């Protein structure tokens, strides 16, 4: 009888609750919401973050980060998505990915794993794109797992391991750093105009080692700019950063009179400005919890080197600003550090005059309840930069909620051109 | 406080007061409909107003919304054609499953 | 026992909901005025399924 061809703008409420938990230094999705082209989106999240109960009182605060991204479906499917919308009703169904059989094999995607073992691929593919563009180190290779079932238990359960806060050892110079550059002069002659050309080519190589390892960085150096559709990267909408604090509880019985237990409870807000959605896609929110990288057995570089030369100590501007980067070992910074090839990296020529490390007294070593890196970070450069959550197990009491937990309410309001429920159920 | 305005009683009878206590219906193993269906067609995802407002109600199963949900006749019911674009469910992490002290519908 | 707060599964469409409605057209012909009458009777049935059961 009466065929409907259009719809008014209606206020849709997409608010819901979230019960979240995770580990230290792993990225995990906490909320998502699919969107349609032409929508007007707004988000506001309010909740409280908690850590597991501590073995002692409060010593060090933790840092919490919240992120929101928008990913069009065209970035995930490509040409398949283009033909999908042009065909219309008789379009081919989109491809899928395979998941595991347990209930928690997709916890990093913020959803319960369906019993069928099959789910759409836009959440898994959007997670990889975010990680490879914003969170991993620029010099390490991308993650290219095809299906969620290809991950190990740790990655699927809690998320991918992220990088420590920047220090001398956790933010070294990239591995493709050269300390020498050779030329092909003659046996008894040299071209000096050719020498000038050699320095010019070395300058462009050093630019791409320190600043420009991505395509959008190269364009930015010329003074241009690239849209997020040019390099197929997710669009960041909002970032929030805050510190979590709490209070202490005192024991009052015979045995525990004089000891204390700390609990962390912090309220937060994550507000995203109004956004106009240009195409069909998804909007995802993620969280990250980290501690400042304090190590017990770390000392000053001048203390660790022992025998000091004029270059080390004088701080002469002519020598500091004209020498190639120096290669140092982990032994020079940590007790029992290594000397082999895997314990070697390169730093600035006088970096020790621009920072001072933190000191932990030997009375605090091997003491439960203090969030510390006991000893030194182990492994090669890749394992040294990435955070390992199992090293923080000595700070918390064993519980089923991991190392941190939160409860938040996401206030989502969208203006959508969709027919009402009454229109959908009445034939005439 | 429960205050009732003044009332004129027209005939013999009784006046009764009752109480009801409920929790919001949050289930641990519940997921989005688009996640549970898996293979998505143009009708499911495009949100085209012509198709949304002119199609008969769709029948879905409990499997499409809950883990280990059923498929038989007793686990089937009917919803609006694009109801999943008008609401979003709550998420409970797997660490909270089978944990005493949280008012939840387990499963 | 009372009912849960309204959700997608706790507030479904009533069990007397039809997804089809048949007519008795001819073998090679159809009355189109009769077709208009069929839609009118379907509208009153859907009113009593969704809104007016009391």
């Amino acid at each position: 009888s009466n065929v409907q061809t259009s719809a008014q703008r209606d206020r849709i409420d997409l608010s819901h609750l979230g019960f979240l938990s995770g580990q230290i230094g792993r990225l995990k999705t906490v909320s998502f919401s699919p969107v349609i082209a032409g929508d007007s989106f707004e988000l506001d999240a309010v909740g409280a973050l908690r850590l597991s109960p501590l073995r002692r009182g409060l010593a060090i605060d933790s840092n919490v980060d919240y992120f929101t991204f928008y990913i069009p479906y065209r970035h995930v499917y490509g040409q398949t998505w283009i033909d999908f919308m042009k065909d219309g009703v008789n379009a081919t169904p989109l491809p899928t990915v395979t998941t595991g059989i347990d209930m928690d094999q997709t916890a990093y995607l913020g959803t319960v794993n369906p019993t069928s073992g099959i789910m759409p691929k836009f959440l898994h593919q959007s997670y990889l794109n975010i990680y490879n563009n914003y969170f991993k180190a620029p010099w390490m290779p991308d993650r290219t797992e095809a299906n969620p079932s290809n991950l190990n238990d740790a990655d699927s359960r809690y998320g991918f391991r992220c990088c420590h806060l920047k220090t001398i050892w956790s933010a070294p110079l990239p591995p493709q750093t050269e300390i020498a550059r050779e030329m092909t002069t003659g046996s008894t002659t040299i071209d000096i105009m050719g020498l000038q050309s050699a320095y010019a080519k070395l300058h462009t190589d050093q630019e791409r080692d320190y600043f420009m390892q991505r395509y959008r960085d190269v364009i930015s150096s010329f003074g241009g700019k690239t849209s997020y559709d040019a390099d197929n990267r997710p669009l960041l909408l909002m970032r929030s950063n805050f510190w979590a604090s709490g209070y202490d509880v005192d024991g009052t019985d015979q045995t525990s009179l004089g000891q204390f237990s700390g609990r962390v409870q912090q309220t937060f807000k994550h507000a995203v400005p109004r956004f106009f959605v240009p195409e069909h896609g998804v909007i995802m929110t993620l969280a990250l919890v980290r501690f400042p990288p304090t190590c017990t057995e770390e000392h000053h570089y001048l203390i660790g080197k022992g025998s000091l030369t004029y270059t080390d100590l004088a701080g002469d501007p002519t020598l500091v600003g004209n020498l190639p980067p120096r290669e140092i070992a982990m032994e020079n910074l940590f007790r029992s550090g290594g000397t082999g090839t895997d314990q070697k990296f390169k730093v600035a020529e006088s970096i020790w005059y621009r920072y001072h490390p933190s000191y932990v007294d030997s009375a605090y070593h091997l003491l439960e309840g203090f969030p510390f890196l006991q000893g030194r970070p182990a492994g090669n450069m890749t394992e040294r930069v990435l955070i390992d959550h199992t090293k923080y197990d000595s700070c918390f009491q064993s519980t089923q909620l991991g190392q941190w937990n939160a409860q938040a309410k996401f206030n989502v309001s969208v203006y959508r051109s969709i027919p009402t429920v009454r229109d959908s159920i009445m034939t005439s | 406080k429960h205050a009732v305005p003044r009332f004129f009683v027209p005939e013999h009878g009784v006046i009764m007061t009752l109480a009801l206590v409920r929790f919001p219906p949050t289930c641990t193993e519940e997921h989005h409909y688009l996640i549970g269906k898996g293979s998505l067609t143009y009708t499911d995802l495009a949100g085209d107003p012509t198709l949304v407002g002119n199609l008969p109600p769709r029948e879905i199963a409990m499997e499409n919304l809950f883990r280990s949900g059923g498929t038989g006749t007793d686990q089937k019911f009917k919803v609006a054609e694009s109801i999943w674009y008008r609401y979003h469910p709550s998420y409970v992490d797997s660490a909270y499953h089978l944990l005493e002290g949280f008012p939840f519908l387990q499963g | 026992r009372c009912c849960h707060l309204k959700t997608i599964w706790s507030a479904p469409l009533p069990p007397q909901t039809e997804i089809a409605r048949e007519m008795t057209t001819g073998s090679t012909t159809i009355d189109i005025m009769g077709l208009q009458s069929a839609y009118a009777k379907l509208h009153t049935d859907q009113e009593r399924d969704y809104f007016m059961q009391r």
Binding site: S15, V421 | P25 | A11, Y50
Partner: peptide, 26 residues
């Protein structure tokens, strides 16, 4: 100690009706 994220399961309803069960239900 916690109002918004402990009271209710969603946001305020300012829009079209979503549920039709055949009449009033409480």
């Amino acid at each position: 100690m916690a109002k918004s994220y402990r009271r209710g399961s969603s946001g305020k309803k300012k829009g079209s009706r979503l549920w039709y069960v055949g009449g009033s239900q409480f």
